[PDB]
Structures are given as C-alpha cells and as structure tokens.
Structure 1
Amino acid sequence: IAHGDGRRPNKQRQYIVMKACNKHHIGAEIELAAADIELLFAEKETPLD
C-alpha cells in the first residue's frame, strides 16, 4: 500500500518458498501355498480335477 507518511516507502518483497516431495511406501504380503501352485499348471482331465 502506498502511504502518505514520512517513513521510508518500503519496496515490495518477492518470497521464493522452496518445497519438497514427501515420499511414502506401502506394501502387503500374500501367501500362496505350494499345494496351490502345483495343481495350477498340472494337467487335468477328470471332472474332479
């Protein structure tokens, strides 16, 4: 604001605010039993398999 008093008319100030990026990591663990992987690729022909 331009003022009408006797003090020093202060110049504007440009601030340079320098931010960052907070990183985060999320992970969940999933077990698969070995008797489940084994009969996934196994050849099947009977109606029970």
Structure 2
Amino acid sequence: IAHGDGRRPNKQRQYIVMKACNKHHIGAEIELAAADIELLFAEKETPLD
C-alpha cells in the first residue's frame, strides 16, 4: 500500500520459492515352491495329474 506519512515507502518485491519431489521405494515379497516351478510345464498324463 502506498501511504503518505514520513516512512520510507518500499518498492516492488519478488520471491523465489523452490520445491522438489520426494522419492519413495516400496518393497514386497513372493516365495514360490520348488515343485510348482517344476510341474508348471508337464502335460498329457493321467486325469489325476
């Protein structure tokens, strides 16, 4: 505001505002079986299999 008393009136102003992202990793887990990875590829056998 321009005001007319005996201050020092001040000129135009300006600002520098720096913002940055923040990183987040997230880590989970799956274990699988020995036999499951094995018998994923068999075929053709008895209706029990």
TM-score by length of 1: 0.78
**Cα RMSD for the two superposed structures:** 1.4
CA shift, 1:32, in A, is 0.3
Q: Which 4+ residue blocks in structure 1 deviate beyond 3 angstroms?
A: none
Structure 1 spans left out of the alignment, 5+ residues? none
Aligned to 1:3: 3
- Other structure's SS at 1:35 match: helix
Paired-residue identity, %: 100
Q: State the Cα deviation string for residues 3-42 of structure 1 (Å, max 9, x = none).
A: 1211111123211111111101001010001111111112
- For structure 2, the 5+ residue unaligned runs are none
Alignment CA distance shift 1:37-1:44 (3 Å)? farther
**In 2: Cα distance, 1:25 partner to 1:43 partner:** 40
1:4–1:42 distance in 2 versus 1, CA, 3 Å: same
Stretch of structure 1 that moved more, 9-18 or 22-31: 9-18
